[PDB]
């Protein structure tokens, strides 16, 4: 995960020689300079008469990017006539296979061909060329007097390549024997020492190779891919011999003794063509010092969700026993046509962490197919097929892709950290890619908490400011910078330290540090060489119990890690990173001893008593209450305290009240649950003996119908508590009250009436207006000013009428809306006015014999008008005296009332009465 | 009256086509800016705009032809016929739809694009001779399975390189058997001879024309010559409008990707046509085998059936692959080739399962959705197939036609055709948002009552 | 080093039969193709039978068919051609020669045949 | 098939260079040799599928071409080189030889 894709060495030579075919790293014991190998097959050279010879060329990974061609020769094809090859090193692709040891590197051509003295009959022998030191080797078991696809004429040498553990050659040669394919091996000492330029069939002493097989086996190719490793237990390294279309196809992979060419073990692939034994590579996995076996098969066949086939690729995996007994696993593509099996090779110990392990390429995949390698950590129980990192390539097709990991080399620690680097070939591009690791540090963390309970009266810390002194407690941070390869001695490690992370948002500091005062302190930790787990101590100090009302909420301490880079790097910018499963988050949580007795059992004493503030509630609107809740604690504290008060749903919720000082400020919620209505307060959830809260509870009181004389309010505080968890309940009444003040009010249409109103004359028997005199409308209202409706009330009219024996205001007509009926005693318009088309001063109803009109007046809603008018005449012989020029008149009429009976029924009633006088001023 | 393009439509000619199918649009005077505008058809209509200017297009489904289906194969004279429409009518507005359906039999009687291809390594040299009799015979006894059958040839040898050819290790190899009295071709790779014809007594005589070649490596090129022949459907004679049959002829296993390795070959097989002016895959040199991955998908995407007919020795590779290349089958061929016409047209009646249909020369405008009816009245969105089909048997689609945006006012040939048959349904289609509202337009300052504007489509601007 | 010895020429009637061989060493004989060309007095050089290493395939010059038989033993290390209903066509100095893939790569010195009346 | 050889003969002074022309009546790929035949001596192969040397043959003779037309060149040509070349058809049967060049020394 630690190599990155930012700054790779970025290796390439000439177009179209396809360089990336294979790749290697060369470290001489001649220096401290190493070089990476690449080969590049069509590569046109010096040699005369020769094309597509392919080379391989050397580089320098010190930037000095260019590669140079390694000097394995120099001539033309050799001859036998002048000019006659007798090798022909053309279109033989030299570099297609790459490998080296120490100083000596030895490269492929798998399409070197042969001309025999005994035939004219080019022949696909395949060799190699050994380049020791300075010293050129021709490297050829493969050619010999078996001339011919019977013999080993077709062996193809070099299409594979390995050297075992000390000095042996490992060279696949899969089309010897009728393509059955065959594994040439040899000590490469003997290859140097016995060679002799003028014989092209030399033998020799210590050569293995892989014995003729049985028709059964044709068109195998065992040489396609080769690994080594301590497969039959100890001693020489044995071959692992890819062979792809072995078992009919379906392919396989032959261990061989290193010192015997006899197989071993035989794995294979379980679906046709999927190429198994493509790539072979070997590795100890599980850091257990044994060899597994890991096998591609890139055109591998896999199954969806839909059952439909999907080539992917497949690395199959062996894991070695003591027994042979291999147990396995499958990596697969994730991709279609991204073929994963294509490349396998060792990584080494990415993270230095005990294992090797390796990478994965799927050189087609990737929108734009520039080719996936998947980067991996080993296990003790296998690999962990899911990737951490992918390599990808960066370059466009010329014209074939890339092919991005086809070929790959690793676990070598190329810069000056022992963390191994992947050499990535891309031979469709003529590129190769060094991706380069940072160091893998996994850092042991520790926070610990001596006094890890509290106590709130244990004051004896100094606070640094002080004459007061702290209850408080010790946190204890410790590092441990745990890392292999080559890393700087000295990590630097920053550490930030946070107390009470979940009451900082938003809610009360419950504890800070003695000498910051803050709830924070950080520190540049130098942690060196690993295991050193030094430690720094803070010292917390727990807030004041006379503030801070919190008893079983944990505190928690959490310790917050970041490795730094530049001041943990080395000098060409390798900086470390942590191990991808390490976690910088680690905590201790602390408690407080919650008062609980003697015997550590919280055993409370819950209590709760109300104080009305309004005791009445007046029946047709909505009322305010507010009821002041005290809640006690009389015994121990308690866990999760709240108020819990049933309310009628008439009575709606408003809040806890926020407008006294002298209250507590408690949250408080609205709810409905399986039937009920509640108001739920936060007493705070961890309670401690001797809280005292007091808040006001507002409501709004409509109970607008015929309800009961009160309404009331069950409260109880409780907890979630061992013990005691529920208080007794207060049960609180507020008297309920009709209220229904009813004002009485009336106006004369005009206020006053002026004696000569034009042509105004008395009549015998007067018709219409102009001959009785000027119409005045007298209005009475009755209207519901209180909150409480009514169903019935009285409106009592006296209108005066016969002063002496002079009869002044004749009523026209009873003009009456709302749920208004009049009856008279007196006969009513005795005059017959039939107009519509609308004790000498006060002439008041104690004077002048007054109609008594008695409305019944029924049910009004709050805010109704009730009302009455009285359109009556003015008769001109009763007003315009005659025995004595004339007098101003009060003319007085009295409206009263009476409200009788309310639909409250079970509810305190008093009568509601009133009255009002109207008059009109004559003049 | 006021119904939606009466606020939406009223400021534009071809707006109100877009927004609903149920508005018209005066013009010449009838209603000049009288009140209401656009509205439905009939409000217009009422209000003194009855005569032909309210130039009124409706989203329309109208069949052109409907020539029935065909109970069999049999009935000759009138045209035997697969599906049901054969010529739809379709006018979209913008941004709407109209609903068909293809209703397709598989009558005894559905036409057959057949491929010979032929292993011509020199043990065939006496199949290329019992084949003289073929092409013929072989389409008489299709006869029977349908009236209309092509047959094509093709062969291969393998790719002609260093580890498969005998590497002309001398010239001798160049044109080989030289070895044993006798003379035989070089290796190409992959030839394409004739292209499928329903002159099938071509076939005779272009086999009697061929002769074989030398190879070293005993596994074929079958491969690399099974995917051209899959995928070169320009030359090789497919007629979308036909079943494809891909008959692949031999007497040995073939060579896979990344065997490839061997010749330097290491370049991927993208699944291409590579064959070029001369009927050769001019790819055979450098590019690898394909995948049984990619035969698949080629296969499958384009409907193409392969048919091993491979004799007896090799047959446990074969079938293997076929199970590894999902809707293909496996044969058992004579030594002589005698039964590849029994090998045919029993590997036709296996075969025969499935309905799956195609859209040719579709627009970038135009979206095609599809409900397959595959079992009794019960639709699968989302197919353009159903399986599990019996000869015999029908397959009902439902196809929604649905038109983006208001594409140019020219007419488009859809091309709703069944893969396998001859049969297809030509949706012509036209769009509906240009029309002579718009050509009738004299803005002319005046016009718009007492003002200076512009007037279209019967309202001013 | 590879050696090769023809003899069994002379003077032939017409209508006659002659049989030549050829003796060969210093090479695996049984795994090279044979063949016989004869020089014709304009000094033009014909080629007139091939046998194959192992002796299964046989070709001859069309003018030859059905009068020349071309053999081998591979345990003699010895070359044979059987002439017969020999014509005055036939006068040439017949050579033996070993095959490198259609080429002639070893040649005999030359045994001398006559037909002559 | 029939394989026409130019020139018939060639007079060439010792240094100078000469070439020898075959004519092919048909492709015969590159299966083409030639062959040098000295006085009272038997025919050797010089040049072998029309430009592949043998094992003790001079760089000086070079062969080349396809198809239809091959040559033999003989640089800097020496008094030894005097006799008669034959170019020799290797594709189909019955196989065919040149009429032959003499090639003379001129002193």
């Known amino acids: 995960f630690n190599l990155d894709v930012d700054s790779p060495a970025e290796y390439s030579g000439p177009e179209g020689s396809y360089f990336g075919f294979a790749v290697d790293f060369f470290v001489p014991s001649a220096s401290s300079r190493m070089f990476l190998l690449v080969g590049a097959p069509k590569a046109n050279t010096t040699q005369p008469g020769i094309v597509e010879g392919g080379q391989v060329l050397k580089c320098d990974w010190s930037s000095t990017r260019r590669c140079q061609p390694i000097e394995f020769d120099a001539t033309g094809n050799r001859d036998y006539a002048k000019d006659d090859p007798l090798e022909f090193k053309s279109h033989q692709w030299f570099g297609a296979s790459v490998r080296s040891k120490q100083d000596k590197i030895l490269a492929c051509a798998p399409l070197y061909h042969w001309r025999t003295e005994m035939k004219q009959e080019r022949e696909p022998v395949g060799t190699c060329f050994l380049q020791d030191g300075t010293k050129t080797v021709e490297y050829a078991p493969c050619r010999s007097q078996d001339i011919d696809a019977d013999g080993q004429g077709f062996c193809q040498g070099g299409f594979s390549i390995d050297f075992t553990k000390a000095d042996r050659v490992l060279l696949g040669g899969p089309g010897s024997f009728y393509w059955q394919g065959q594994l040439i091996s040899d000590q490469v000492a003997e290859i140097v020492s016995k060679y002799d330029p003028n014989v092209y069939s030399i033998k020799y002493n210590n050569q293995l190779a892989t014995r003729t097989a049985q028709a059964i086996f044709d068109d195998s190719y065992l040489g396609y891919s080769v690994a080594v490793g301590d497969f039959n237990g100890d001693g020489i390294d044995d071959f692992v011999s890819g062979v792809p279309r072995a078992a009919r196809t379906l392919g396989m992979v032959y261990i061989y003794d290193g010192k015997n060419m006899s197989s071993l073990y035989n794995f294979t692939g379980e679906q046709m063509a999927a190429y198994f034994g493509f790539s072979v590579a070997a590795t100890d996995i599980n850091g257990d010092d044994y060899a597994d076996v890991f096998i591609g098969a890139p055109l591998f066949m896999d199954r969806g969700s839909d059952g439909k086939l999907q080539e992917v690729g497949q690395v199959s995996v062996s894991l070695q026993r003591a027994s042979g007994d291999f147990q396995t696993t499958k990596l697969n593509g994730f991709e279609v046509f991204a073929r994963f099996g294509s490349a396998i090779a060792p990584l080494g110990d990415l993270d230095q962490d005990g294992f090797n392990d390796i990478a994965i390429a799927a050189p087609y995949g990737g929108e734009d197919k520039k080719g996936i390698v998947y980067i991996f950590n080993g296990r003790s129980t296998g690999l962990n097929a899911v990737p951490s990192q992918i390599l990808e390539g960066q370059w466009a097709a010329r014209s074939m892709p890339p092919s991005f990991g086809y070929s790959m080399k690793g676990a070598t620690d190329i810069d000056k950290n022992g963390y191994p680097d992947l050499i990535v070939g891309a031979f469709g591009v003529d590129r190769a890619i060094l991706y380069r690791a940072r160091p893998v540090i996994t850092v042991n963390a520790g926070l610990e908490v001596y006094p890890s309970i509290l106590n709130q009266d244990n004051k004896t810390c100094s606070l640094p400011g002080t004459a007061l002194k702290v209850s408080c407690f010790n946190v204890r941070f410790c590092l441990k910078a745990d890392g292999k390869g080559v890393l700087p001695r000295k990590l630097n490690f920053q550490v930030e330290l946070l107390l009470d992370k979940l009451k900082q948002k938003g809610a009360i500091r419950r504890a800070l540090f003695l000498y910051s005062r803050s709830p924070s302190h950080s520190k540049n930790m130098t942690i060196s060489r690993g295991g050193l787990m030094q430690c720094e101590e803070l010292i917390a100090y727990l807030r004041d119990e006379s503030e801070f009302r919190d008893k079983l909420t944990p505190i928690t301490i959490f310790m917050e890690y970041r490795l730094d880079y530049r001041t943990a790097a080395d000098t060409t910018g390798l900086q470390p990173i942590l191990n991808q499963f390490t976690p910088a988050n680690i905590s201790r949580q602390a408690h407080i001893l919650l008062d609980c007795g003697e015997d550590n059992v919280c055993k409370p004493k819950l209590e709760v008593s109300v104080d009305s503030d309004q005791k009445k509630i007046y029946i047709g609107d909505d009322n305010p209450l507010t009821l002041i809740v005290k809640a006690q604690n009389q015994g121990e504290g308690a866990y999760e305290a709240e108020l819990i008060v049933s309310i009628p749903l008439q009575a709606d919720f408003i809040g806890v009240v926020r407008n006294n000082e002298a209250l507590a400020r408690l949250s408080c919620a609205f709810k409905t649950e399986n039937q009920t209505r509640q108001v739920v307060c936060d007493l705070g959830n961890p309670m401690k003996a001797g809280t005292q809260l007091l808040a006001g509870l507002r409501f709004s009181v409509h109970q607008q119908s015929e309800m009961d004389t009160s309404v009331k309010f069950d409260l109880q505080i409780q907890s979630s508590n061992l013990f005691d968890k529920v208080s007794p309940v207060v049960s609180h009444k507020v008297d309920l009250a009709v209220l229904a003040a009813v004002e009485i009010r009336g106006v004369s249409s005009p206020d006053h009436i002026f004696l000569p109103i034009p042509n105004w004359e008395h009549k015998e028997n007067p018709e219409t207006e102009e001959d009785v005199g000027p119409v005045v409308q007298h209005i009475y209202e009755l209207r519901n000013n209180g909150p409480s409706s009514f169903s019935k009330a009285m409106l009592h009219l006296q209108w005066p009428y016969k002063y002496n024996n002079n009869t002044l205001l004749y009523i026209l007509h009873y003009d009456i809306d709302g749920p208004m009926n009049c009856t008279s005693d007196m006969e009513i318009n005795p005059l017959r006015i039939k107009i519509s088309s609308l004790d000498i001063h006060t002439l008041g109803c104690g004077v002048a014999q007054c109609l008594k009109i008695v409305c019944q007046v029924g049910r009004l809603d709050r805010g109704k008008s009730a009302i009455l008018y009285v359109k009556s005449l003015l008769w001109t012989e009763t007003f315009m005296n005659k025995e004595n020029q004339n007098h101003s008149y009060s003319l007085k009429s009295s409206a009263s009332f009476n409200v009788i009976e309310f639909p409250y029924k079970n509810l305190p009633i008093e009568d509601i009465t009133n009255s009002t006088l109207v008059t009109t001023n004559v003049t | 009256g006021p119904n939606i393009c009466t606020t939406r439509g009223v400021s534009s000619c071809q707006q109100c086509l877009a927004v609903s199918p149920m508005c018209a649009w005066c013009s010449d005077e009838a209603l000049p800016l009288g009140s209401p505008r656009c509205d439905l058809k009939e409000n217009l209509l009422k209000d003194n705009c009855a005569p032909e200017s309210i130039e009124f297009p409706v989203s329309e489904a109208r069949v052109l032809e409907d020539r029935p289906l065909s109970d069999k194969g049999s009935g000759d004279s009138s045209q035997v016929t697969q599906v049901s429409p054969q010529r739809i009518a379709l006018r979209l507005r913008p941004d709407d739809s109209k609903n068909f359906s293809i209703q397709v039999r598989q009558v005894e009687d559905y036409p057959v694009d057949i491929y010979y291809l032929m292993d011509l390594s020199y043990s065939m040299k006496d199949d290329l001779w019992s084949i003289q009799n073929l092409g013929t015979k072989l389409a008489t006894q299709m006869r029977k399975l349908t009236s209309n059958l092509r047959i094509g040839f093709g062969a291969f040898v393998d790719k002609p390189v260093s580890p498969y050819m005998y590497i002309s290790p001398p010239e001798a190899l160049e044109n080989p058997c030289y070895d044993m009295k006798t003379t035989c071709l070089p290796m190409f790779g992959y030839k394409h001879v004739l292209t499928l014809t329903d002159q099938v007594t071509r076939f005779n005589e272009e086999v009697k024309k061929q002769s074989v070649s030398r190879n070293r490596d005993a596994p074929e090129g079958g491969f690399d010559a099974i995917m051209q022949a899959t995928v070169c459907d320009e030359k090789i004679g497919w007629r979308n409008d036909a079943s494809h049959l891909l008959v692949f002829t031999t007497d040995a296993k073939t060579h896979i990707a990344l065997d490839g390795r061997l010749a330097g070959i290491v370049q991927p097989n993208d699944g291409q046509c590579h064959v070029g002016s001369d009927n050769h895959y001019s790819a055979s040199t450098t590019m690898d085998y394909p995948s049984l991955g990619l035969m698949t998908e080629k296969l499958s995407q384009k409907n193409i059936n392969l048919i091993f007919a491979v004799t007896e020795n090799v047959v446990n590779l074969y079938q293997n692959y076929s199970e590894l290349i999902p809707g293909t089958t496996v044969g058992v061929l004579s030594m002589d080739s005698s039964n590849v016409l029994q090998l045919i047209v029993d590997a036709y009646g296996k075969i025969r399962s499935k309905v799956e249909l195609e859209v040719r020369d579709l627009p970038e405008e135009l979206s095609l959705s599809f409900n397959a009816t595959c079992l009794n009245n019960e639709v699968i969105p989302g197919l353009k197939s159903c399986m599990g089909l019996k000869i015999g048997d029908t397959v009902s689609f439902s196809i929604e036609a649905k038109v983006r945006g208001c594409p140019q006012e020219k007419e488009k040939s859809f091309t709703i055709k069944p893969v396998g048959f001859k049969d297809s349904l030509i949706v012509q289609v036209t769009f509906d948002c240009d029309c002579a509202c718009q050509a009738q337009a004299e803005p002319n300052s005046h016009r718009c009552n007492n003002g200076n504007g512009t007037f279209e489509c019967g309202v001013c601007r | 080093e590879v050696q090769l010895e023809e003899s069994g020429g002379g003077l032939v009637k017409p209508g006659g039969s002659l049989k030549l061989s050829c003796a060969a060493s210093?090479?695996?004989?049984?795994?090279?193709?044979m063949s016989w060309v004869r020089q014709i007095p304009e000094k033009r050089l014909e080629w007139v039978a091939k046998?194959?290493?192992?002796?299964?395939?046989?070709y001859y010059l069309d003018t030859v068919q059905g009068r020349f038989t071309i053999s081998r033993d591979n345990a003699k290390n010895t070359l044979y051609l059987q002439m017969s209903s020999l014509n005055s066509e036939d006068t040439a100095m017949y050579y033996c020669?070993?095959?490198?893939?259609?080429?002639?790569?070893?040649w005999g010195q030359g045994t001398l045949v006559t037909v002559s009346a | 098939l029939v394989m026409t050889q130019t020139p018939a003969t060639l007079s060439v002074t010792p240094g100078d260079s000469v070439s020898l022309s075959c004519r092919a009546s048909?492709?015969?790929?590159?299966?083409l040799h030639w062959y040098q035949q000295k006085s009272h001596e038997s025919p050797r192969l010089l040049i072998k599928?029309?430009?592949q040397s043998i094992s003790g043959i001079p760089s000086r003779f070079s062969g080349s071409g396809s198809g239809t037309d091959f040559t033999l060149s003989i640089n800097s040509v020496e008094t030894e080189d005097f006799g008669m070349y034959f170019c020799?058809?290797?594709?189909?049967?019955?196989?065919?030889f040149g009429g032959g060049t003499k090639l003379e020394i001129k002193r």
């Open positions: 020669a070993r095959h490198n893939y259609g080429s002639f790569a070893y």
């Open positions: 599928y029309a430009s």
């Open positions: 048909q492709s015969i790929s590159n299966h």
């Open positions: 210093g090479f695996a004989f049984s795994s090279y193709d």
């Open positions: 046998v194959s290493s192992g002796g299964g395939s046989t």
């Open positions: 020799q058809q290797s594709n189909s049967w019955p196989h065919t």
